[PDB]
């Protein structure tokens, strides 16, 4: 069992270093099976309607599409197990980082009580494999030494799942692999992975690829990956939901205006509505109101010139001036304004979202991300802002300070490094400069 | 503590450190002429490692014109002869791996076994203007003779890199700390041109960072970046999380909570390189 | 020069030298340079409009194929939605040009078979490809020109 | 960068330029750190000695 286990971690590691290459071939083969699908044909003749493939001087295309569909479902399943190998330890680590500081600092589950995320997280405090994917594992003794005097300590120990709290603490002071696994922790960890929006998109990608063997026309929806893949065409799709509250009421407003335009047409202008050009077989559409309201919202918002394009002309003397005012105020409202409100609502939503992606780049190229002085102060010396960025205030040096403080001992720290280390563990950020960086206070005494 | 640093400045510590710099500069050019004297020379390089961090811990909380830095530099110009011998030591043995790394000097040797003679490598290093006349017979006297036909440039290069990595880094840190704290000094400007190579070699390994504490005074904090930490920093999976984190802070993130998000971004990247170091081949 | 010497072979080849007015004056060069100033963003939207219309033809090919018939003669029937490469060429030629959707060129859904599926199908096709995506493209050049 | 390699070895390099002693600028600048016979064969200087 030892050789099969190391062959499993060799296959899982070989796949995860090629995670970007594997999805490149997953999209290339996704576009390859939908390019060849353009040559389908329906016929009454055999090869009811049948779906047979047509090709000129090539008979290899039908075994190819059967080969690429099994190759796409295989490569999609390796992508799921790859995302279940690589980024799912990352997505738990940000949640048990936020909760373990939510438990100890402000006390989310000990002094107050709550959101579905607050009550789903109750299944993870009583497992002993709580800090298993976290750098801090003494978090439960942090909060019992903090809030174990104000309340009953036996109740908070039963809340925190600490097995033998008066015996394991004395044992730590002085001195069937699946059956050893916790069933409450893995049902909890499989619950939050299902909350993740990327995995339900990756889960939608695999469940439709396996549905593509039932009908090969189901491979069409994987070419909508170009909308979510590149960031250019995702701002077009996210602009619909960015201002989606304002759009659903305007189409709600357009629904009640057109329904108020059909009721006036149903009571006074009903003899005009007749699309049938045959005299003996008359089809008057304005006889039932649910029939006619479906007729208005299908041709009236599509014609561009109002409802009167599909209706006979008002050359008759009966209701000649009422109708000619009726179509004009209908054309002025639903197409000229309300349909220009909707395209007036998405394109500036599309316009503003790209304006905030360009201003993020511009303000980053101007301000310093750490201290509160612009790039106009550092214009006194040439290349002063790049000297202020790369050498003095760099975001990579602030991490490189941190992991250097992780690796070295507490008895090897100097006074400046032990001061920022004690200020970081109680989580206060007054050690950052924020508006002065060696060129405002010593500006007269350095030349 | 301001009390001890004025007590060490008003004591006779300076003639002790000058005398310790005198015995260190002469023994390392005496103990480098034999291969059985390796244990004493590493123990000495760890000892002058301990003094320069003692000298760096004296310079903590130092004002841009303070008396600790000026009594540190006049101690250096009272003792010019030996600290030029320590920085010439760290120059000639760091330049040689850049010298033996050239395409010319590996083309001047044609032995298949790799044991080059002593006369051919002496005329080769004399052709380059980076090394001088009395320097090269010092380096062949420090090398293994082996009947004047085997110098073994590979083992002579990596011999004094590993014991002299830490001290060669910290005398570079001591010079850059004193230069940017007290400027407009010609004798310190004498010292950086004399030790230019140990600064440019340790520039991507030195990180300069500033924090603000101790009665609202900004100080410059100096630390080390190892080679493994920067090699995993410039990988595409790490910078793609960097590109989106910069985006979600200046666009929708707050002003006071942006440094709380920065440290939450920092601890996440320590973990994602740790899961990357676990999955590395 | 190479097109002016080609103009003696056919004198209609002298037409392309009146495009010098686009590059000569700086006024009409910003109209021509605005296409290539934001040309990366435009080629993906027409790439996005290509895969939405192709996803609109596959739904029409499997469920709405008996509706597509442009022939007004009963004995000689021309059903365009029989081959998919024929029909996808039909959608990107009349559907993005009509201004009111694909249903202008197709018979009305007065029959009971697929009466509510089709009347929702044309509306969400008209809402996407003309009202938004074709206003995205003219929304992309004019502000680039602006 | 690679198309410009065909112009260093011609003697009519500075013929349409105000500076014509550019090759002796760079041999006096980088002729000690490398082999000077190689940089003279790179620069096309016919009979540099
Ligand atoms: N700590 C900082 N404070 C303020 N501004 C910073 C800081 N770090 C970087 N910047 C600014 O943001 C930019 C970030 O550059 P980034 O690494 O994202 O891309 P880049 O410079 O185009 O990379 P490359 O050219 O190496 O591919 C810097 O060039 C600088 O203008
Ligand atoms: C947002 N969709 C995805 O995450 C995605 C998810 C799955 Cl299961 C499969 C594929 C092919 C996906 N699509 C990409 O993964 C992808 C689409 C585009 Br367009 N580009 N692109 C990409 N991006 C970076 C590196 C390599 C690639 Cl291939
Ligand atoms: C290993 N490790 C970490 O990985 C870590 C940390 N603080 C944050 N992190 C992420 N500390 C103190 C630590 O010892
Ligand atoms: Ca210490
Ligand atoms: Zn700054």
């Amino acid at each position: 069992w030892g050789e099969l286990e190391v062959q499993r971690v060799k296959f899982l590691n070989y796949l995860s270093r090629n995670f970007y290459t594997l999805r490149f071939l997953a999209l290339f083969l996704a576009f390859a099976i939908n390019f060849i699908l353009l040559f389908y044909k329906v016929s009454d003749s055999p090869p009811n309607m049948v779906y047979y493939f047509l090709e000129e001087s090539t008979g290899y295309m039908e075994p190819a599409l059967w080969c690429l569909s099994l190759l796409h479902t295989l490569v999609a399943f390796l992508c799921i197990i790859g995302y279940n190998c690589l980024k799912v330890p990352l997505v738990i680590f940000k949640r048990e980082k936020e909760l373990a500081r939510k438990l100890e600092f402000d006390g989310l589950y000990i002094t107050e009580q709550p959101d579905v995320k607050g009550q789903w997280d109750r299944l993870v405090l009583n497992t002993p494999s709580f800090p298993s994917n976290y750098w801090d594992k003494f978090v439960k003794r942090k909060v019992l030494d903090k809030h174990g005097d104000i309340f009953g300590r036996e109740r908070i120990a039963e809340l925190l799942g600490m097995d033998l709290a008066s015996l394991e603490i004395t044992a730590h002071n002085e001195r069937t692999w699946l059956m050893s696994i916790d069933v409450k922790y893995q049902i909890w960890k499989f619950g939050v992975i299902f909350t993740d929006n990327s995995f339900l998109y990756l889960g939608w990608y695999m469940v439709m690829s396996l549905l593509g063997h039932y009908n090969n026309f189901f491979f069409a929806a994987h070419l909508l990956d170009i909308a979510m893949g590149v960031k250019t065409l995702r701002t077009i799709l996210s602009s619909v939901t960015h201002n989606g509250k304002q759009l659903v009421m305007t189409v709600g407003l357009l629904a009640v205006v057109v329904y108020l335009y059909t009721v006036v047409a149903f009571n006074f202008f009903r003899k005009f509505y007749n699309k049938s050009e045959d005299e003996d077989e008359p089809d008057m559409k304005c006889d039932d109101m649910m029939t006619c309201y479906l007729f208005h919202m299908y041709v009236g918002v599509r014609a561009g010139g109002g409802i009167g394009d599909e209706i006979e002309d008002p050359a008759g003397d009966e209701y000649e001036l009422y109708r000619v005012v009726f179509d004009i105020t209908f054309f002025f409202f639903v197409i000229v304004i309300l349909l220009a409100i909707i395209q007036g609502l998405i394109i500036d939503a599309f316009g503003e979202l790209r304006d905030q992606q360009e201003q993020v780049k511009e303000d980053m190229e101007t301000k310093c991300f750490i201290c509160g002085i612009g790039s106009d102060y550092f214009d006194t010396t040439p290349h002063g802002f790049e000297t202020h960025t790369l050498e003095e205030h760099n975001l990579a040096n602030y991490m490189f300070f941190l992991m250097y403080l992780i690796n070295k001992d507490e008895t090897e720290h100097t006074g400046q490094e032990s001061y920022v280390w004690k200020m970081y563990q109680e989580r206060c950020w007054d050690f950052f400069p924020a508006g002065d960086c060696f060129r405002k206070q010593y500006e007269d005494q350095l030349s | 503590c301001t009390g001890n640093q004025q007590s060490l400045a008003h004591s006779r510590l300076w003639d002790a450190v000058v005398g310790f710099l005198h015995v260190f500069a002469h023994m390392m050019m005496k103990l480098a002429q034999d291969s059985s004297q390796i244990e004493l020379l590493k123990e000495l390089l760890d000892l002058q490692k301990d003094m320069v961090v003692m000298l760096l811990s004296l310079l903590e909380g130092n004002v841009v014109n303070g008396m600790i830095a000026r009594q540190m530099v006049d101690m250096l110009v009272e003792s010019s002869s030996n600290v030029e011998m320590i920085l010439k030591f760290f120059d000639m043995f760091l330049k040689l791996k850049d010298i033996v790394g050239s395409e010319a000097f590996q083309d001047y040797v044609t032995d298949p076994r790799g044991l080059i003679s002593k006369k051919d490598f002496q005329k080769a290093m004399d052709s380059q203007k980076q090394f001088t006349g009395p320097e090269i017979q010092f380096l062949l006297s420090c090398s293994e003779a082996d009947e004047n036909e085997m110098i073994n440039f590979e083992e002579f290069a990596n011999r004094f890199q590993e014991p002299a990595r830490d001290i060669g880094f910290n005398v570079a840190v001591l010079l850059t700390n004193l230069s940017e704290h007290v400027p407009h000094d010609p004798r310190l400007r004498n010292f950086l041109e004399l030790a230019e190579s140990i600064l440019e070699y340790f520039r991507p390994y030195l990180g300069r960072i500033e924090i603000m504490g101790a009665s609202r005074r900004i100080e410059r904090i100096y630390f080390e970046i190892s080679e493994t930490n920067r090699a995993q920093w410039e990988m595409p999976q790490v910078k793609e999380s960097k590109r989106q984190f910069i985006f979600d802070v200046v666009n929708e993130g707050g002003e006071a909570e942006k440094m709380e998000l920065f440290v939450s971004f920092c601890e996440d990247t320590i973990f994602e390189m740790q899961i990357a170091a676990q999955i590395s081949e």
Side-chain angles (χ1 to χ4, degrees), chain A residues 2 6 8-9 11-43 46-48 50-54 58-61 63-111 113-114 116-153 155-157 159-162 165-166 171 182-276 280 282-287 289-316 319 321-364 366-375 377-378 380-442 445-447, chain B residues 1-97 99-101 104-106 108-110 112-115 117 124 131-134 136-145 151-153 155-183 186-188 190-215 218-226 228-254 256 258-259 261-280:
Chain A
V6 60
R8 186 275 320 287
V9 310
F11 177 71
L12 261 67
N13 210 13
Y14 157 73
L15 183 161
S16 160
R17 311 183 310 277
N18 313 335
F19 188 74
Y20 280 41
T21 300
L22 193 142
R23 311 176 321 179
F24 212 103
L25 173 149
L27 173 82
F28 165 69
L29 196 83
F31 211 109
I33 183 169
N34 297 66
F35 160 70
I36 183 175
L37 198 140
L38 283 168
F39 310 138
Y40 262 55
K41 213 174 171 312
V42 303
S43 49
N48 61 345
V50 302
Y51 299 148
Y52 80 108
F53 189 75
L54 175 48
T58 301
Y60 184 74
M61 263 187 196
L65 171 140
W66 187 85
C67 180
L68 296 197
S69 56
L70 275 296
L71 211 116
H72 176 242
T73 296
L74 171 149
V75 77
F77 189 102
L78 307 182
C79 167
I80 297 303
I81 200 184
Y83 186 80
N84 217 324
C85 165
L86 185 61
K87 300 320 212 63
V88 302
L90 202 69
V91 74
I92 313 303
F93 181 93
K94 299 197 0 359
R95 188 209 268 288
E96 43 187 39
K97 185 183 53 93
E98 67 87 10
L99 175 140
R101 295 151 145 180
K102 265 211 212 162
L103 191 46
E104 186 270 357
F105 286 97
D106 40 18
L108 173 82
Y109 292 132
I110 57 171
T111 78
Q113 284 306 353
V116 64
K117 283 76 150 153
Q119 277 55 32
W120 181 249
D121 282 358
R122 216 182 224 96
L123 278 52
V124 80
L125 298 103
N126 309 97
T127 176
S129 86
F130 181 31
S132 72
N133 195 350
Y134 195 42
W135 61 270
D136 197 328
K137 321 224 181 163
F138 313 119
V139 57
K140 313 153 104 171
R141 309 182 197 65
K142 293 265 183 61
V143 76
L144 177 48
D145 294 329
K146 205 153 150 63
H147 302 78
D149 47 350
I150 206 62
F151 300 138
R153 45 182 312 120
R155 174 180 40 273
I156 199 184
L159 173 47
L160 263 27
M162 261 195 288
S166 279
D182 196 307
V183 307
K184 204 171 151 213
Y185 179 71
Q186 267 64 10
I187 199 184
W188 174 89
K189 187 181 44 55
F190 284 6
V192 51
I193 284 168
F194 281 43
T195 302
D196 191 276
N197 305 120
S198 158
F199 187 94
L200 312 186
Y201 160 70
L202 266 71
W204 164 82
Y205 198 88
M206 215 285 298
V207 76
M208 275 206 60
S209 159
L210 201 42
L211 210 60
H213 289 107
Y214 192 40
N215 185 26
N216 303 57
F217 291 96
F218 267 105
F219 281 104
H222 309 146
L223 297 202
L224 279 183
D225 188 17
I226 317 301
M228 321 311 312
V230 309
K231 190 200 41 173
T232 298
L233 317 172
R234 186 188 340 133
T235 71
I236 321 184
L237 194 140
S238 105
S239 63
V240 193
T241 175
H242 172 63
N243 223 337
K245 300 328 162 203
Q246 266 100 327
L247 171 148
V248 62
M249 274 157 254
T250 69
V251 309
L253 173 55
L254 183 159
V256 309
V257 176
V258 166
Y259 166 73
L260 266 44
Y261 268 104
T262 192
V263 58
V264 175
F266 193 105
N267 304 357
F268 309 130
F269 300 140
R270 98 160 67 113
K271 65 177 184 299
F272 290 95
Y273 285 78
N274 180 10
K275 292 293 301 143
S276 160
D280 214 37
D283 195 344
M284 260 165 48
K285 289 238 208 218
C286 198
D287 270 40
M289 184 108 110
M290 183 54 218
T291 297
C292 180
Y293 170 67
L294 175 150
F295 165 71
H296 280 290
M297 262 196 69
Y298 176 63
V299 306
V301 303
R302 292 199 309 88
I307 202 59
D309 278 355
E310 289 59 41
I311 318 174
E312 287 68 20
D313 54 0
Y319 292 155
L321 210 55
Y322 284 157
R323 170 148 204 290
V324 79
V325 169
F326 179 77
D327 186 18
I328 284 181
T329 188
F330 175 73
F331 152 75
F332 183 69
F333 282 168
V334 194
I335 319 163
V336 178
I337 304 313
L338 280 158
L339 261 172
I341 282 286
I342 297 155
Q343 75 182 341
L345 262 173
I346 294 196
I347 311 302
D348 53 355
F350 173 74
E352 171 52 9
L353 293 191
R354 280 185 330 128
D355 296 346
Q356 42 203 299
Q357 307 176 158
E358 61 82 13
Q359 197 270 358
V360 159
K361 186 276 292 182
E362 195 281 338
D363 198 303
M364 196 61 245
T366 302
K367 275 205 52 63
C368 206
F369 188 52
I370 299 193
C371 68
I373 16 209
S375 159
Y377 193 104
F378 306 106
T380 76
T381 174
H383 292 247
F385 194 79
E386 187 271 357
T387 315
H388 210 89
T389 301
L390 276 293
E391 310 298 5
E392 289 187 299
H393 267 185
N394 184 26
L395 84 171
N397 280 124
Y398 273 73
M399 202 188 34
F400 282 157
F401 194 22
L402 173 54
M403 320 186 307
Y404 172 70
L405 285 177
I406 304 313
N407 198 296
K408 67 183 321 182
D409 296 10
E410 301 214 350
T411 49
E412 292 290 40
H413 284 165
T414 77
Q416 294 145 320
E417 312 169 309
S418 86
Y419 167 72
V420 60
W421 180 252
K422 73 171 308 311
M423 262 195 59
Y424 161 70
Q425 292 195 120
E426 51 81 24
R427 300 269 297 188
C428 174
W429 327 116
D430 300 358
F431 60 94
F432 290 105
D436 37 16
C437 179
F438 216 80
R439 307 223 212 145
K440 292 253 282 193
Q441 49 270 353
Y442 301 147
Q445 311 145 60
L446 74 86
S447 54
Chain B
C1 202
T2 76
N4 301 7
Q5 307 172 216
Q6 313 311 347
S7 302
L8 284 197
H10 299 346
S11 87
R12 207 169 54 270
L13 179 66
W14 311 109
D15 326 51
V17 166
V18 159
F20 276 120
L21 276 180
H22 161 261
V23 59
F24 286 167
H26 297 206
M27 286 295 293
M28 304 180 312
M29 311 169 162
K30 180 202 153 34
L31 298 178
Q33 272 86 329
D34 196 278
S35 159
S36 315
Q37 275 168 28
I38 185 56
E39 320 308 336
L40 196 45
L41 196 158
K42 312 200 302 274
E43 186 46 6
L44 194 169
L45 285 182
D46 301 359
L47 180 54
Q48 47 183 58
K49 176 37 181 52
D50 213 41
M51 185 220 300
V52 303
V53 60
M54 198 273 269
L55 286 180
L56 277 161
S57 46
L58 176 47
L59 288 166
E60 60 157 48
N62 189 358
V63 163
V64 75
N65 263 307
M67 52 79 88
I68 295 99
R70 310 215 280 295
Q71 306 165 169
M72 181 93 57
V73 59
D74 58 18
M75 172 215 78
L76 283 178
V77 298
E78 181 188 323
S79 170
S80 312
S81 45
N82 39 0
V83 66
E84 268 83 302
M85 295 174 35
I86 200 155
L87 299 183
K88 178 190 41 192
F89 187 22
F90 288 157
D91 190 15
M92 310 175 285
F93 272 58
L94 182 62
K95 197 155 294 158
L96 172 149
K97 212 144 170 161
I99 283 299
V100 79
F105 303 126
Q106 310 146 39
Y108 283 10
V109 53
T110 54
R113 312 251 356 346
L115 279 53
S117 135
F131 272 10
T132 58
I136 182 62
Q137 313 112 342
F138 184 75
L139 266 69
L140 315 173
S141 64
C142 284
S143 66
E144 312 315 281
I151 48 184
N152 199 342
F153 50 86
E155 66 84 13
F156 189 65
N158 51 24
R159 184 146 280 190
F160 301 140
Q161 283 319 325
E162 179 40 34
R165 260 200 50 74
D166 49 49
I167 179 56
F169 178 95
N170 269 353
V171 291
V173 170
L174 180 62
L175 286 178
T176 180
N177 191 350
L178 214 54
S179 56
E180 319 166 359
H181 269 256
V182 291
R187 314 144 312 170
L188 258 183
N190 189 10
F191 282 150
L192 281 91
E193 53 111 38
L194 272 162
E196 59 83 12
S197 174
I198 48 183
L199 309 192
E200 310 315 279
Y201 173 71
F202 286 122
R203 262 191 53 258
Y205 288 176
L206 172 149
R208 41 179 70 74
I209 194 167
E210 39 271 25
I211 71 155
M212 184 270 313
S215 77
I218 202 154
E219 322 96 308
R220 301 271 291 279
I221 310 313
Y222 294 89
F223 65 98
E224 73 99 23
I225 307 139
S226 156
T228 319
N229 297 11
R230 195 197 269 279
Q232 302 173 48
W233 172 247
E234 310 298 3
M235 280 178 29
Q237 178 204 351
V238 172
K239 302 178 308 318
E240 61 80 31
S241 160
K242 184 251 211 183
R243 263 133 181 83
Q244 307 154 217
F245 173 71
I246 282 146
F247 187 90
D248 47 45
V249 167
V250 305
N251 191 326
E252 55 269 17
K258 74 165 310 302
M259 300 274 89
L261 283 175
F262 190 17
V263 300
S264 278
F265 166 70
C266 292
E267 307 163 338
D268 189 14
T269 69
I270 314 183
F271 183 55
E272 71 191 306
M273 308 181 263
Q274 179 214 329
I275 186 65
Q278 174 184 143
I279 69 154
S280 314

